Amino acid sequence: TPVTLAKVIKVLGRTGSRGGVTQVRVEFLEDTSRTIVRNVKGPVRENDILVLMESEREARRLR
Amino acid sequence: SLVVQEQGSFQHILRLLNTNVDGNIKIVYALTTIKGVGRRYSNLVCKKADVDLHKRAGELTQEELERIVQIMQNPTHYKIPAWFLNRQNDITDGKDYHTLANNVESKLRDDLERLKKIRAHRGIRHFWGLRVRGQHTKTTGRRRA
Amino acid sequence: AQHAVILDQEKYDRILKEVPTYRYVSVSVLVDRLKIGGSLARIALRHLEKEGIIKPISKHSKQAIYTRAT
Amino acid sequence: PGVSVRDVAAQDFINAYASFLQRQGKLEVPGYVDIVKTSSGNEMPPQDAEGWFYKRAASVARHIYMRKQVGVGKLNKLYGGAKSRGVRPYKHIDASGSINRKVLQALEKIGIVEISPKGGRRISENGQRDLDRIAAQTLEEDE
Amino acid sequence: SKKRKLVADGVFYAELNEFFTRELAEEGYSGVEIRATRTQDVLGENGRRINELTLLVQKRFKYAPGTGLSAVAQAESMKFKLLNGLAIRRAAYGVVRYVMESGAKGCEVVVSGKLRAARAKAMKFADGFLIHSGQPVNDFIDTATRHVLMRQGVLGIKVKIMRDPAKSRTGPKALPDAVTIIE
Amino acid sequence: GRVRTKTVKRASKALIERYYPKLTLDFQTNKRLCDEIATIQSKRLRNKIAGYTTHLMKRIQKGPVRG
Amino acid sequence: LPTKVLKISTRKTPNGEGSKTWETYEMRIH
Amino acid sequence: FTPVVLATPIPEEVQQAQTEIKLFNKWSFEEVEVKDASLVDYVQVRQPIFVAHTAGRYANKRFRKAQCPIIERLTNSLMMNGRNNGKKLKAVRIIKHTLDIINVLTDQNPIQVVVDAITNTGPREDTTRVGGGGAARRQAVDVSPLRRVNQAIALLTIGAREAAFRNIKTIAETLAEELINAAKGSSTSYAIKKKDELERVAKSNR
Amino acid sequence: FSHPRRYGKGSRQCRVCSSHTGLIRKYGLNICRQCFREKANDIGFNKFR
Amino acid sequence: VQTFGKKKSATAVAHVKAGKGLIKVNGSPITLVEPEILRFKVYEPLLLVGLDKFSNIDIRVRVTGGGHVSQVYAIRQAIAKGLVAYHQKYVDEQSKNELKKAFTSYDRTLLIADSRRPEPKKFGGKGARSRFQKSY
RNA sequence: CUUAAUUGCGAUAACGAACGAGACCUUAACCUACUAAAUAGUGGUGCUAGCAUUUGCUGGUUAUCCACUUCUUAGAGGGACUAUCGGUUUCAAGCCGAUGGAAGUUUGAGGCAAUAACAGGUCUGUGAUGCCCUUAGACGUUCUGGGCCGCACGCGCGCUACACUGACGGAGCCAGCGAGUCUAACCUUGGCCGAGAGGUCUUGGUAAUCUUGUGAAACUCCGUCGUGCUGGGGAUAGAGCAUUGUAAUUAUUGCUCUUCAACGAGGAAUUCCUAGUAAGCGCAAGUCAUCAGCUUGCGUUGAUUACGUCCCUGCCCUUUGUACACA
Ligand SMILES: [Mg+2]
Ligand SMILES: [Mg+2]
Ligand SMILES: [Mg+2]
Ligand SMILES: [Mg+2]
Ligand SMILES: [Mg+2]
Ligand SMILES: [Mg+2]
Ligand SMILES: [Mg+2]
Ligand SMILES: [Mg+2]
Ligand SMILES: [Mg+2]
Ligand SMILES: [Mg+2]
Ligand SMILES: [Mg+2]
Ligand SMILES: [Mg+2]
Ligand SMILES: [Mg+2]
Ligand SMILES: [Zn+2]
Structure with a gap:
């Protein structure tokens, strides 16, 4: 069970047919030119903190 | 209590008048496992038969059950009031009785086969297998067997 | 009925040589380490409560909390 | 040291000082303790067999001391818990009233309480004695 | 008690x-x-x-x-008129002709039953300004309902009137919406 | 939601079509002004009839408005 | 004095059909 | 440690907990350290409660749900099963009951290892599913902050009573080595035996 | 031509109907509920909430 | 100088004045509490504040209504709304301002007369918002 | 765009309007304010009871004095306006935070309710009832007795649960909503007999006074039984004592002793639900001669989680097609 991080910036929108899954734009502290969107099952909003298990392979609009 | 020692003192499960009465459970609740005596009954009999019910019939002896096995084979004598027992006013000899043993249904089918013996509707229904006591046999007790 | 009647002096040594190395033992732990049942030993653990090498914590009801002397 | 029974709380005062009328010799029990249940809504008897009422009495003296008269009814309404009515719901059953009646005829049998004008049982001058007697001695034991 | x-x-x-x-x-x-x-x-x-x-x-x-600003006096005002015999078309407009310029805001009269034996006529005759509804109706209405027993099929009236809130004669002085100032 | 009806607003515009001189620039100070110049039959209506005259004058300094 | 409302909760329909809708009338004394 | 009483009995073993080293009602409340970045600002600890029974207005709105102590929010994630929903005093008795059990093994101070036991607890990623209707295509999304507290503060009772049904051991007698297991990342717990399992769908779905 | 009918519902009859059905024996009025709400408001029984 | 303490149906008329010294709850003093678990709940109106010199207290509080829990809040608010009310027109102000500050940085329904009250039951339903199980 | 809304900003061959929603009305909260009382609640006095005893602990004083409006209750009114300042606006209409804070989902919960519908339900509510059927071996009314509850069975609202956050047992003892008796027997304190059921005896109460602090339950503190179907479970079943009532048999109902059946957390499905909510708990009132596992309400205890989307099921507004208008 490995290591790495990122964390929140600013909310945009919902997806999932049921409207549950939310993805939003967040950023990594070190080497701050780092940013791409990402879905998370739980609740987020402005300035929270992400938790994943891989480094960078993003998701998009869950049909 | 505490360390009670003893090597073979306790003839756990021990046949109290044709009843297998296992030992690890206390005596007031070991005779739950005896016919005709229930949770309350072995709280009276085993209390005025003067044996401290903090203990187990398993450990005890062949003795301190002996005077339980009489103070309720006829509780009518020493300090047992007149409704703690199944069959009051007997119904044929007036002499107040109690039904204990592999005999409870051998007396709970004594009258469950006497008004079942004289054309009384209150018996007919557990004869035909239905809930006699004016209960809605329509929605409930359907399978039951 | 399954195991533990009332007796066993057969390995009665574990009365005191029980409490350290896994700091915590209490009321039901009596039935844990392949020992007993719980009706002839529910009252057992104040033999060493009054003298020995153990340590007090609680006086609830439906509970117990104890580890050895430090 | 400035002591009132209304200065020590629940069973501190009653589950220990029952030792004292545990200790008043006169058996005074009409022959049915070990053989009753304290109320209609109960499936098995009290558990202190040759006792349970050497301790019940204090709860009577407990509520009577603190304010004015109580009576037969107002002490059937406490020990009547939720009844297993069978396969039907629970209820507030009513506690016993007969044991709660020589709760008093065997209560002045040591003399602690009195009776009331308004209909009831008011705490007695000797009652005020003993419960302020008993509560002033228990604290200089433990903290 | x-x-x-x-x-x-x-x-x-x-x-x-x-x-x-x-x-x-x-x-x-x-x-x-x-x-x-x-x-x-x-x-x-x-x-x-x-x-x-x-x-x-x-x-x-x-x-x-x-x-005539009460309905229980006007829903029988002319309930006779029917069981005596007139047209149920113009007679009904007469009563709402009647009360409406009696300085009154709104009126409404319905007749329900068998005009001709079918699923039964229910035609309705209104005139004016009838607040409904909220609390200001309890203040401003009267409505009565009287079963009319004619020989083939019972019928039934539901008259409603309303008090002019201006010339109120008791209680509130106008509709709780009221707005006005001077230039 | 939080969005007042037209009798809150059509009145509020009929206030200040001839009454440009008057009013204050906020609520408490001003709300015994509204028991003042209408036959408002509700303590709670003129209560909120000032909650809409709030910003008619709170942005009197950021541009006169409709009608 | 404290006022006591007299409440009569009766179901809104003459027959036994519809949704089971009740309604409480009040009598308010003083 | 300000040793005074007034005209009523104050055993001063009480006027001691907070104008001293202000700790728990009985546990050192300051060496309180989080073991993960997954959950800071989202477990509350410090400021403390004396009793985990602040009956405040903390669920009135959206995300005030976690500005009350994790001590509190787990109070609530336990008292359920219908039989004991409502009935909050059967819960907070036991939390300050077995909080003692944690200062036993290797003492390590209970609440230090509590947020050490939200290390391995909730999920790193569960995998929500896509609309469809069929093979249940669930494309993996990583976890949000508040559901590795909230459903971590729930994935600690989702199946934690299945080891108290017609068996012997009491409720409070449990969590310390579920606590350390979640602090140790064990092989036997629930909250980590089932986050790893919430990610048997782990690195497959990207 | 008569036999004991002292108490019970055969005893009490509606004021407006003698309808034994739907009795409301509250406040000593003794009318049925089909029957009451028709004659409701005129007793000062109104609806507020 | 008197107040109320209200959580629910339980309102604790809170006597306070420079009186006698006792900590009463309808009955007996701080002696008789007996949650003995939440016993510590009324233990936050005078601990992040001055700890004592209250042999001149009027800490009589009668919680008639509510329940065991309903009335534990009712007396610590009874103290709150009555202890802070002592230094309002009787004694200095910049310790009321400067220890009701110590209340509100920890506030747990002290001078907040709790707005939260129950909801009526709606017919055709188990309780207020719940309904009967839908039959088709 | 936006709102709970044809609610509004805006756009505009529309303009200005009325009904509906909203406003309005009831209730649960707060006012240390004016207006307030042995029918409410608290200190206090001529004084009285008990522990310590230089004055406090806890009271008692139903025609013993003195006080108070903080509690209660509630007359007149005040107060919330999203007020103020941020986050995002577009020009706003506004939505997500924050402080104030008695009070931020329209403050919470309701009452009302447009234009029209539908062979919808009730003739088993109406002395409301058209017309028919019936009107002396009556379908009318009554008296006697039985039946609506009858069980190889399916189903719907439910109650008691499967037990160690449990059961038994002392015991601490917390409500609120509410009803109650003159040609009379309703609410029963409090006595006293009783094992309880209940008996009996007074007594207060036409009711902020008495029942009633409805001394409720879950609860809970202290003990108890260590996981079988065991007491969890109380079903079926036998014996005995009562209470209603001309009349309890097919147990009306209760209390006591023996009985001790599944059921070991429930398949496909399916419901209800967002805050003092769900859920648990018991309490009143309706029913009531009697009888709750029902109903309407009530407070005690009080979470989890979302404060979002059309994926399903439905509904509303546009566009479009029609050979339907009985739609
Ligand atoms: Mg209990
Ligand atoms: Mg049972
Ligand atoms: Mg409206
Ligand atoms: Mg008839
Ligand atoms: Mg279905
Ligand atoms: Mg079907
Ligand atoms: Mg129809
Ligand atoms: Mg039927
Ligand atoms: Mg079924
Ligand atoms: Mg009586
Ligand atoms: Mg049974
Ligand atoms: Mg029914
Ligand atoms: Mg759809
Ligand atoms: Zn009628």
Whole structure:
């Protein structure tokens, strides 16, 4: 069970047919030119903190 | 209590008048496992038969059950009031009785086969297998067997 | 009925040589380490409560909390 | 040291000082303790067999001391818990009233309480004695 | 008591009017207070109806020898007119012709039953400004409903009126919407 | 939601079509002004009839408005 | 004095059909 | 440690907990350290409660749900099963009951290892599913902050009573080595035996 | 031509109907509920909430 | 100088004045509490504040209504709304301002008369918002 | 765009309007304010009871004095306006935070309710009832007795649960909503007999006074039984004592002793639900001669989680097609 991080910036929108899954734009502290969107099952909003298990392979609009 | 020692003192499960009465459970609740005596009954009999019910019939002896096995084979004598027992006013000899043993249904089918013996509707229904006591046999007790 | 009647002096040594190395033992732990049942030993653990090498914590009801002397 | 029974709380005062009328010799029990249940809504008897009422009495003296008269009814309404009515719901059953009646005829049998004008049982001058007697001695034991 | 009493104030106050649009209707009844439409045939032949049943008010009700802006007056105002026989088309516009310029805001009259034996006529005749609804209707309306017993199929009226909130004659002075200032 | 009806607003515009001189620039100070110049039959209506005259004058300094 | 409302909760329909809708009338004394 | 009483009995073993080293009601409340970045600002600890029974207005709105102590929010994630929903005093008795059990093994101070036991607890990623209707295509999304507290503060009771049904051991007698297991990342717990399992769908779905 | 009918519902009859059905024996009015609400408001029984 | 303490149906008329010294709850003093678990709940109106010199207290509080829990809040608010009310027109102000500050940085329904009250039951339903199980 | 909304900003061959929603009305909260009382609640006095005893602990004083409006209750009114300042606006209409804070989902919960519908339900509510059927071996009314509850069975609202956050047992003892008796027997304190059921005896109460602090339950503190179907479970079943009632048999109902059946957390499905909510708990009132596992309400205890989307099921507004208008 490995290591790495990122964390929140600013909310945009919902997806999932049921409207549950939310993805939003967040950023990594070190080497701050780092940013791409990402879905998370739980609740987020402005300035929270992400938790994943891989480094960078993003998701998009869950049909 | 505490360390009670003893090597073979306790003839756990021990046949109290044709009843297998296992030992690890206390005596007031070991005779739950005896016919005709229930949770309350072995709280009276085993209390005025003067044996401290903090203990187990398993450990005890062949003795301190002996005077339980009489103070309720006829509780009518020493300090047992007149409704703690199944069959009051007997119904044929007036002499107040109690039904204990592999005999409870051998007396709970004594009258469950006497008004079942004289054309009384209150018996007919557990004869035909239905809930006699004016209960809605329509929605409930359907399978039951 | 399954195991533990009332007796066993057969390995009665574990009365005191029980409490350290896994700091915590209490009321039901009596039935844990392949020992007993719980009706002839529910009252057992104040033999060493009054003298020995153990340590007090609680006086609830439906509970117990104890580890050895430090 | 400035002591009132209304200065020590629940069973501190009653589950220990029952030792004292545990200790008043006169058996005074009409022959049915070990053989009753304290109320209609109960499936098995009290558990202190040759006792349970050497301790019940204090709860009577407990509520009577603190304010004015109580009576037969107002002490059937406490020990009547939720009844297993069978396969039907629970209820507030009513506690016993007969044991709660020589709760008093065997209560002045040591003399602690009195009776009331308004209909009831008011705490007695000797009652005020003993419960302020008993509560002033228990604290200089433990903290 | 007192609860079983102030009810009996009203529940005595009630059965009276069961006894009033039954016996004083043809004689022109409007409402206990005794409000009325016609008021002689209530007295009687100088005495025939005044006391024909005050003498029965006691020997039934436990006593002794000696002790158009309303709808309930307008829903029977001319309920006679039907069971006597006119057109149910223009007669109904007459009554809402009537009360409306009696300085009144709004009126509405419906007749329900078998005009011709079918799933039954229910036509409706309105005129004016009828606030409804909220609390300002309890203040500003009267509505009555009287079963009309003609020989083939019962019918039934539901008249409604409304008080001009301007010339209110009691309570609020206008609609709770009210807005006005000067230039 | 939080969005007042037209009788809150059509009145509020009829206030200040001839009454440009008057008013204050906020609520408490001003709300015994509104028991003042209409036959408002609700303590709670003129209560909120100032909650809409709030910003008619709070942005009197950021541009006169409709009608 | 404290006022006591007299409440009569009766179901809104003469027959036994519809949704099971009740309604409480009040009598308010003083 | 300000040793005073007034005209009523104050055993001063009480006027001691907070104008001293202000700790728990009985546990050192300051060496309180989080073991993960997954959950800071989202577990509350410090400021403390004396009793985990602040009956405040903390669920009135959206995300005030976690500005009350994790001590509190787990109070609530336990008292359920219908039989004991409501009935909050059967819960907070036991939390300050077995909070003692944690200062036993290797003492390590209970609440230090509590947020050490939200290390391995909730999920790193569960995998929500896509609309469809069929094979249940669930494309993996990583976890949000508040559901590795909230459903971590729930994935600690989702199946934690299945080891108290017709068996012997009491409720409070449990969590310390579920606590350390979640602090140790064990092989036997629930909250980590089932986050790893919430990610048997782990690195497959990207 | 008569036998004991002292108590019960055969005893009490509606004021407006003698309808033994739907009795409300509250506040000493003794009318049925079909029956009451028709004659409701005139007793000062109104609806507020 | 008197107040109320209200959580629910339980309102604790809170006597306070420079009186006698006792900590009463309808009955007996701080002696008789007996949650003995939440016993510590009324233990936050005078611990982040001055700890004592209250042999001149009027800490009589009668919680008639509510329940065991309903009335534990009712007396610590009874103290709150009555202890802070002592230094309002009787004694200095910049310790009321400067220890009701110590209340509100920890506030747990002290001078907040709790707005939260129950909801009426709606017919055709188990309780207020719940309904009967839908039959088709 | 936006709102709970044809609610509004805006756009505009529309303009200005009325109904509906909203406003309005009831209630649960707060006012240390004016107006307030042995029918409410608290200190206090001529004084009285008990522990310590230089004055406090806890009271008692139903025609013993003195006080108070903080509690209660509630007359007149005040107060919330999203007020103020941020986050995002577009020009706003506004939505997500924050402080104030008694009070931020329209403050919470309701009452009302437009234009029209539908062979919808009720003639088993109406002395509301058209017309028919019936009207002396009556379908009318009554008296006697039985039946609506009858069980190889399916189903719907439910109650008691499967037990160690449990059961038994002392015991601490917390409500609120509410009803109650004159040609009379309703609410029963409090006595006293009783094992309880209940008996009996007074007594207060037409009711902020008495029942009633409805001394409720879950609860809970202290103990107890260590996981079988065991007491969890109380079903079926036998014996005995009562209470209603001309009349309890097919147990009306209760209390006591023996009985001790599944059921070991429930398949396909399916419901209800967002805050003092769900859920648990018991309490009143309706029913009531009697009888709750029902109903309407009530407070005690009080979470989890979302403060979002059309994926399903439905509904509303546009566009479009029609050979439907009985739609
Ligand atoms: Mg209990
Ligand atoms: Mg049972
Ligand atoms: Mg409206
Ligand atoms: Mg009839
Ligand atoms: Mg279905
Ligand atoms: Mg079907
Ligand atoms: Mg129809
Ligand atoms: Mg039927
Ligand atoms: Mg079924
Ligand atoms: Mg009686
Ligand atoms: Mg049984
Ligand atoms: Mg029913
Ligand atoms: Mg859809
Ligand atoms: Zn009728």
